[PDB]
Structures are given as structure tokens and as C-alpha cells.
Amino acid sequence: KSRGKICTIGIAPWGIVENQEDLIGRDVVRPYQTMSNPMSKLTVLNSMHSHFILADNGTTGKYGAEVKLRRQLEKHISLQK
Amino acid sequence: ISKHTQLSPTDAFGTIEFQGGGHSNKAMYVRVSFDTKPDLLLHLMTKEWQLELPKLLISVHGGLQNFELQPKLKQVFGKGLIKAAMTTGAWIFTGGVNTGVIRHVGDALKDHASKSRGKICTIGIAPWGIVENQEDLIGRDVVRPYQTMSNPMSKLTVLNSMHSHFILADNGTTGKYGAEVKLRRQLEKHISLQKINTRIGQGVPVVALIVEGGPNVISIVLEYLRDTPPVPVVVCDGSGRASDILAFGHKYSEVTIQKTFTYTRTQAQHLFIILMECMKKKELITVFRMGSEGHQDIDLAILTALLKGANASAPDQLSLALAWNRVDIARSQIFIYGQQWPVGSLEQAMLDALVLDRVDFVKLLIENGVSMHRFLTISRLEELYNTRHGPSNTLYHLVRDVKKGNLPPDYRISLIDIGLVIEYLMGGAYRCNYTRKRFRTLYHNLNHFPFPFHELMVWAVLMKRQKMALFFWQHGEEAMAKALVACKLCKAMAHEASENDMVDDISQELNHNSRDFGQLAVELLDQSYKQDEQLAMKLLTYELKNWSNATCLQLAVAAKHRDFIAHTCSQMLLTDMNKYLGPYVMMIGKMMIDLLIAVFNNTFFEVKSISNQVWKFQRYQLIMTFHERDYGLKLFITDDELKKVHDFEEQCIEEYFREKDDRFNSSNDERIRVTSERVENMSMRLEEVNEREHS
Questions:
Q1: What is the DSSP letter of B494?
Q2: Of B340, B369, B655, the CB nearest to A35
Q3: What does the DSSP 8-state code read for residue B78?
Q4: 8 A C-beta contact, residue B369 and residue A34
Q5: Calpha distance B559→B485 (Å, rounded)
């Protein structure tokens, strides 16, 4: 519809997505494929996102490891002036 | 007799002009024998009448009584029927006499005659012994003026006009029906066998629309359901015949006393078993309710029954939709959550949409996670260049010319020949990507195409699919150089078409396309100069390895785009590389052709403007001649700055398109049109709202 940019911050655990690989190289624009196969029980990252933040957990494809980091980030931003 | 007839040959065929109608309608009449096999009938239809198979076969059934329907239903039904028949290739099979729903559909076809162009295949399977004028038909291969006005005392209904063709069912009976029904059924059987041009393996998708009808039509829909491939059936709620009672029974199907309505011979008559079987096979039955139930579009009601009626596979459904050329159906009916598309189906669908110019389908496929980088193969490219199933173009003749006219039949086209053709079209200074030695080494021993959109646009220009080229033009990078190359190619092809034995429409069409490309390039340069002037200048300067190591300025001058050079930012590139008397000299050059004080006065403005533009155009040629490529012609760039240039160009063209859309949607005329259509629909809907009076 219109121009402009919106800061979208994707805070999810690192092991959830299927393309945990193909994103290991640093400082290189790594293309991502948004077409998701139906067989996989792993969910790709939603598109139209400005910024991604991945919380590596040690395990792969589980929840309950990004809630605390996001909550503390919210507290940190509340601490900001 | 116990049906003992004499088997004589026929003597009546051709076309009859129906006098008494207000519109011209010439129908191909042929009387045949019911003993004949459907194969000969199909051969006659495809050869003696020259009709290609449709993407939909429609069976029509109605009551033999010439009844009338409820108004405000016939209009919308006729509109939906016309849209269904016209938007996709479909045939219609009817009786043909002015009785029952045949009158309604003939009037509906009359309505389309005052609405738009085109012809619709209408076939009337009428028994030969029932029409009033069984005479006035002795002639064969002749035009028989038929009078449309008849009288009830004849008791023999004349044929309704507005039919594309006609078939007269001759078996031997006079004044009694029941001869063409078997032949029509076997014709549907045989036609449904025939393979459609798609590679799925589909026959003819056939549906039957049921309005009114009679107790026989109950057996007919019984047969339709019980066909190996159950032929779905569409019903209308406003009929009032057993079709309406079949809608009632289908409503809240599997309390038995509501069947009785005395419409037949008492409660002693009972179609209980038949009604039970019909409502048992209700899954493929679909009805239409006027506003009380959804799918208000007749076309949508049919199309949904067309697709899900056979429970076809999703790639097969998409292929049928692609054939029907209805992107809305694929978007809505097909594309929903969890469509479980199989592997590799999407690329094949993209190929088939590319070979059939179904551009909206291509856009939809792109929206569905399809990447041209991951799609195109050398084989795919050759297939695109080696197809005949689309618009024609002079390309093959040019190929013959380049190959020095030593052609073999059905030659398998190589892309090296295409590159040589491109070099031939552009010029000697041009250097094709295919002519590079590495390309030859890679190809004859037979990984990917880094910028597929470039060759896609080239192919679209070459094979003359203007809409595809327009679509692909707003994608990728280097759009200005793309437009310049396209304009130059279109001009070269226009000259080639005019110089050769062509209908000369090709040349002017190519001129139109080239002018559009030049206009787009000029507007893109305007946008760039609007955004940042130094960056706009830098855009023209740098070389293009992908484009024969050329630059935008050199191509544009080679493209003879004087208007491009007349742009403000173009001149200051020549400044960084006489303003009054120089333009005055060329004015004198055009004044040599010729009271004359007045004559010279009235021919001053246009000459002045043309002279100014010509001088501004040839400034570059003068400066290059004076100067004669680290600078002056080119500017070798680093990768990072080139990436910045690409991002700048893409952002600029996106902004330009968005601004164009904003200007278009802010024009007064568009607002007036949209508001008027909204007001019309709102008025009709408010009449609907006011219709219900609960008090």
C-alpha cells in the first residue's frame, strides 16, 4: 500500500526451524527459501520480517527457552529512558 | 409395424436462415440416422463443421411443457450461463425446439447478442419428425429461408433460432418424441472418452444443468450419478418441478410423508426407491438457492461442481483451471490452507502457463513459492523456444535467414542459433552471452542461469508475448538497459517484418512496443534524476558484462532514442564528458524545400522544436568524435558500489510504479466509475432489503 519501514524483531529459539543449516556462514547474505515441505514437523520463519534474533538452546526444535530472554529484554527496555 | 423402417440415404444438409427473427442466425442443419455411430458424427462436427473440442461439455434438460420461471431469476441465470459459456471453451447440448427451458436459453443467447462479440457452440439435438416444416428442406448444400412464425394449430413446434448448429434425428416416427435421447447419451459417452490436450490424462469434464424437467429427468440424473465417473448435476431452487422437490429432498437428507403432493397419480404412484437412490448419491449433487445459500454465481456453482465433482488430484485440478483460464478459481477454490502440492508439480505448471500465455497463473505460481532461479533449465529454455502452441511470430523465418536457408523439416532449435540471431539483430559491435566460448563448451557437452529474467524478457520480446514482457520488465535489475535493449530489438524486428513479405501489422505493433519501452526508459531516467542526480549520472556510465560490455548511453543512442538524450540528466553527462547558433543552422537545412512571409511564419514552432531536439541528440555524437574506455565512454566500478546502484535502481522503479498507481487511483474518472458501480449494487441490494416485509 505505502512506503515506510517497520522494525519487526523475531525472537525465537534457534533450533525450531528446519533451515538451521544453510545459515552458518558469517557476514554473507544467505538466501532463505520460504516454500515449506509438508512432511517436515519443523516450521520455517515467517516472511516480511525486519530483524531476526535466534536463541540457541543446546537442543533443537523445542519451546520454553525464549520466554525468559524476551521477558528480560522487555524489562531492559523498560529500564531505558 | 414393429419398428420396421426403410434405410434410404439422406438428402438434406447445409444452413438455414430463420426469417422472422430480429437478429441474424445461421445454423448448420444435418439430418442423420440414429443407427449411426458417434465416431462419424464427431468426425462431421470436427471436419464438416470445424469445431475443436471444448474444455467443458454441458448437458441441458428441461420440461417439455413451455413453462415460465420466476422473474429476477432468469436474468441472473442467463448472465451466469453466458459468462460460463464465454469465459472458457464450452459446448451446450439441447433439444432445439421452442419448448420449455429451450426458450429460456434461446432468449438468454439473444441477450448476449446485444452485449458482446464472439460465437458460442450451441447444438440442438431435435427429433426430425416433430418440427412444423419437415418440408422446406428438400435442398442439400443450399440455404433454405425458414419462417420463424408458427401457429398452435400445427401442434408441431418450430426450431428455436440462436443455435450454432442443428442435428435432425431421423428414425421413422412422426409427431412422437423418444429417438435422440439414446443418441445424445451415447454422444456424451463417446465425447467424454476423448483426451484433452493436457498431459494429465483427462477426458472431457462434463456437467449437466437441471432446470424443471420431469419424472424422466429423475431417471436421467440417476444415470448421470451411476456413470463410472458420476456426472454431477446442478439444480435451481426456483423451478417448481421435481427438480425443486429434489432440492427439498437433498435438503436435510438422511418424515417420509412430505413426499406426497398429488402432482402425479395419487399415493398409488411412488418413486420412493428412485428418490432414495438419488438422495443416497447426493455427494456429487449440488443445487443453487437464490440468496438463501451461497455460490450465487452460476459459473461458480458449475465450476465448483466441475472441479470437485470428479474429486480430481490437486495438480490435475490446477491443470484444468489453467486450461479454463480462470485464475480466481485457483486462487479461491484451489489455493487454501494445506493443499499438499506434490514435488515438481509447480515447475511443470509454470512451464504450461508460460507456453499458453496464462500470465495471471504465472503470477499466482510466483506467489506460491516458485523461484525462476530454481526453475529454468537448458531443456526448459529450448522447450520455450521450440513450441508452436501459442501466438505465431516471424522468428523461424529469421532463423532460416541466419542459417542461410538450408533448413531441415522440424529442426530442433538450438540456443546458439538464438544468440547468433540476437547478434544479427543488434549489430556487429554487439557480443552475445551465448557467443562466449565458455557457453559453447558448457552447452555442447550436453549448471544454472544466474539472471534468468534477462533471457526470459529476451524470449518474450522475440516470440511476441507483449504482456509477459511487460510483467517481467518490472523484475530483477538493470531495468533501464533492459528497456533500451528491448526497444532496439523491437525496432529491428519491425524493420525485418516490413522488409519481408508480412502483413505489416507486425511492424507497427513492434513500433508500438518499442515506443512503450522507450517511454518507460525515459520515465525511469526521470525518476533516477529526481532521486539523486550524481547517482543517476553514474547509472549511465558503468559497463555491463552481461550486456556485451556496453553502457546505457551507447545503447540508447544506438536505439536512436532522441527523447531519452533530451532529458536533463542526459545532457550534463555530455557536459562532464554551440548552444544557440547550432540549433539555428539545422533550421536552415529544413527550410530549403520551399506570400512566403506568411508561409515561413506558420511553419516555425514545429521546426524550432525538432531542431532543438536534433541538436541535443547529436551533441553526444559531436563530443564523442571530438574526444576519440576508463572514462568518456564507461566507468569501471567495484562490486559494492554496483550493489548500491542496483538497490538504488530497484527502489527508484518501485517508487515510480507506486506513484503511478497513486496517480491512477486518484483520477476523478476512476472515482466516478467505481462510485457509480457501488451505487448500482447498493441500490439493488437495498431493493432486496426492502423486499422482506415481516409486518
A1: H
A2: B369
A3: H
A4: yes
A5: 8
For residue B563, how far is the Cα from the chain centroid?
Answer: 35
What experiment produced this structure? cryo-EM
The whole-angstrom distance between residue B126's C-alpha and the CA centroid of its chain comes to: 33
CA proximity to B480, closest of B552, B425, B428, B536 = B552
State the smallest CA–CA distance between residue A33 and chain B in angstroms: 8
C-alpha–C-alpha distance, residues B287 and B438, integer Å: 63
The strand pair at B121-127 and B91-94 is best described as parallel
The backbone torsions φ and ψ at residue B4, rounded to the nearest 5 degrees and listed phi first, read -120, 105
* Cross-chain CB nearest to B369 (options A2, A34, A38): A34
Distance CA B575, CA A77 (A): 54
Grid cell at residue A36: 515449506
Q: What distance in Å separates the CA atoms of residue B157 and residue B28, rounded to the nearest whole number?
A: 19
Interface mutation vs chain A, best among B371, B373, B643, most A CBs within 10 Å: B371
Q: Contact at 8 Å (CB) between B634 and B542?
A: yes
Q: Identify the contact set of chain B against chain A, taking CB-CB distances under 8 A.
A: 338, 340, 368-371, 655, 658
User: What DSSP character marks residue B32?
Assistant: E
- Report d(CA B383, CA B366) in Å as an integer: 20
Cβ atoms B527, B648 nearer than 8 A: no
The structure was resolved to a resolution in Å of 4.7
Query: Is A54 in contact with A13 (CB distance < 8 Å)?
Result: yes
The rounded distance, in Å, linking the Cα atoms of B99 and B159 is 9
- Is the Cβ–Cβ distance between B102 and B62 less than 8 Å? yes
Sequential DSSP letters for B576-643: ----SHHHHHHHHHHTT---HHHHHHHTSHHHHHHHHHHHHHHHHHHHHHHH---SSS-B---HHHHH
Rounded CA gap, B381 and B398, in Å?
A: 19
Classify strands B26-33 and B13-19 as parallel, antiparallel or unpaired.
antiparallel
Amino acid at B73: L
**CA B14 vs CA B10, B26, B144, B148: distances in Å:** 12, 10, 9, 18
Instruction: Name, in order, each residue with C-beta under 8 angstroms of B400's C-beta and a sequence gap of 6 or more.
Output: B407
Distance of CA B250 to the CA centre of its chain: 37
